Amino acid sequence: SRYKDNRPLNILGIDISKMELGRYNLFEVSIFLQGSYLNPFDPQEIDVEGIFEDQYGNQYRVPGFFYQEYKRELKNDYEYLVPVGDPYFKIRFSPINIGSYKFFIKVKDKTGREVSSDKYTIYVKESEKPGYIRVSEKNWRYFKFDNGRQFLPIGANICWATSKGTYDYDVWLPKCAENGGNYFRVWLGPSWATFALERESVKEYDLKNAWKLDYVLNLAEKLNMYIMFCFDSYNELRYQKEGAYPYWEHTPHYEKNGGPLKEPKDFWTNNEMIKYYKNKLRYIVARYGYSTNVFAWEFWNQVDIISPTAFVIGEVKKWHEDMAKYLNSIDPWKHLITTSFAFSPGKPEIDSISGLNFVQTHIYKSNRYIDALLSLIAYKEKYRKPHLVGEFGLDAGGNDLWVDPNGYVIHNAIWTTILSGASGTAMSWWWDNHIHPNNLYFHYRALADFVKDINFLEEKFERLTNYKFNVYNREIKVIGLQGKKYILLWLYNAKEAYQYKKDIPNMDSSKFLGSIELLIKPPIKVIYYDTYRGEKIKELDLDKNVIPIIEFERDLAIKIELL
Missing domain, CATH: 3.20.20.80 (Glycosidases)
Incomplete structure (x- = not known):
């Protein structure tokens, strides 16, 4: 119990990070205290809590935690942390609503004694953060x-x-x-x-x-x-x-x-x-x-x-x-x-x-x-x-x-x-x-x-089925998703995808390898995509359900848009 304390419970100081902050951003409270506890990591010995309430009446009970500040350095090939100051307790909060919040700190130790802080007010503005x-x-x-x-x-x-x-x-x-x-x-x-x-x-x-x-x-x-x-x-x-x-x-x-x-x-x-x-x-x-x-x-x-x-x-x-x-x-x-x-x-x-x-x-x-x-x-x-x-x-x-x-x-x-x-x-x-x-x-x-530009949540994507290859010189396979607006295909050569000795592969958009026909209603737009350079290679408008496959070495991606 290196962090034990044996004094009457009292709050000695509170620092607040910011009084105004953005939605979903960190609001941090530092609490300096004395009390009677053997283990600051055990709530039965000491229990620090922050009680927060938004302007709609929603309440948050946030447990506090024991903290030591450090300053990091590198000693040749290893990180070393130097302690800075005495350890103390913190509360870390994040507001999900904008507007005003009120909060106070409560502390109880093993003696049963309880202390608390006055109430404080903070203000939350909108931010760019998308949330949890x-x-x-x-x-x-x-x-x-x-x-x-x-x-x-x-x-x-x-x-x-x-x-x-x-x-x-x-x-x-x-x-x-x-x-x-x-x-x-x-x-x-x-x-x-x-x-x-x-x-x-x-x-x-x-x-x-x-x-x-x-x-x-x-x-x-x-x-x-x-x-x-x-x-x-x-x-x-x-x-x-x-x-x-x-x-x-x-x-x-x-x-x-x-x-x-x-x-x-x-x-x-x-x-x-x-x-x-x-x-x-x-x-x-x-x-x-x-x-x-x-x-x-x-x-x-x-x-x-x-x-x-x-x-x-x-x-x-x-x-x-x-x-x-x-x-x-x-x-x-x-x-x-x-x-x-x-x-x-x-x-x-x-x-x-x-x-x-x-x-x-x-x-x-x-x-x-x-x-x-x-x-x-x-x-x-x-x-x-x-x-x-x-x-x-x-x-x-x-x-x-x-x-x-x-x-x-x-x-x-x-x-x-x-x-x-x-x-x-x-x-x-x-x-x-x-x-x-x-x-x-x-x-x-x-x-x-x-x-990244497709909303997967809304496409109703399903694992691709109902396809038929027509390919003669090779063994091509597909992994696919079919959605309400997009069909996403990954094509691979079964004889090359599992060999790892060669350098990064190419594709030849002027040459036809074969085709894959799909259960979709034209007209469609087809984008061919180089999966190593991360670039569109070719674009093609079609009024049949037969997608030509351009020549490629290892694997190739295709993005199909139903029009």
Whole structure:
């Protein structure tokens, strides 16, 4: 209990960030106090709250959180954080309505004593921010912002940094954002992770790592990127002898390391662990919940491959139901909630829970992965909620980077997923050793420029069917969406799409390869699109349902507009 206090509860100071701000922007209160508490991360020891009310009478109860300021520096190849000042408490709020708000601070400590502040008034003006990310009510396959515009996630996993820490995100995030990226995922466990909150303990949270997460979230805010926060990874509950990057023996949850658990199975039902996990969720909501740049709360990375001694499907299901209910109940902004599985088909008993707002797939497969992605997307339509292919790669032991230095595998997956009805792109691994050094961002820019001007929420898109190729010299296949106004096609050569040795491909718009006839009524306009240069190649008006296919090397995109 390094942060204990033993004085009569009193507020000693309050600082307010701004008195006027824009819709969905951060309003931050700093509270200096003394009191009696052993653990500032435990609301039973000290409970700080901000009570906000808009001019319509809506009220928000925002938990406060313990904070230490740091100043970052680089010591050669590692980030080092110098503490600045004493730690204190903060409230972070975001107004969803414009107009006036009133608020006050309340504090209670373990003695039962309570103190509070006077009431303060702030004023909120309109802003450009679209709001929080929600499931679309118009098409359950997709996400929207509160303002009704679509959110199509385009990005990759960017889950931790090197020892350079936040300085790596300074490099990776602007490059992603300038190439159409609006999404990434970070890990808040296991204890070695850049943003690990449970670093030394499951009862108290790491203020340096939390500060790094603030920094990265603030950078996302500047770049219009949206983050999935993964709270825990399976490694925490996997024994050394089980392999697959196990970490039980080193995790703070284990009794050997000061935690409450004798074995990982007890994580789901141990009363002390559940209490501390709820405190962690409260801390996460308090510190990050204000942010519209939090796309989703993800409980687990690959919960199915915790130790087999610990995976009890009914208990894991009940825990997800109960924690989703708790997290929603305390999150004033009701961010989306999900969880993930290593097994590509997932676990229906958990994926079907109403408290999980969207489902995911992880898949690492080297052979015929285009067909595997299409099959999994078709299958998970049964859930009638969005589907994110949250991890994707070859099954090559991490050698994707030397088998496919040009990123054709990523290329194939992002086109396949977004034109098959997934909520966004397949999310690659290998951000640090492949995507960045091989400069693969151009693949995402080309795809973003092809999709961004169509409202997917309103096209009534369906996986393409009812087509017939007429092609003689080759084996061409298609992944397609058919909508009320647009038909989006991705064509690929089955004999070239899975070979990765050659340089970037061309196309010849003066030469005819074959045709594809579709069940659509002319007249139509056809745009042919180079998926590597991200450029329109040719445009053609037609009064039949027969689309000529121009010569191309590897793959080609076609945008058809019904007139």
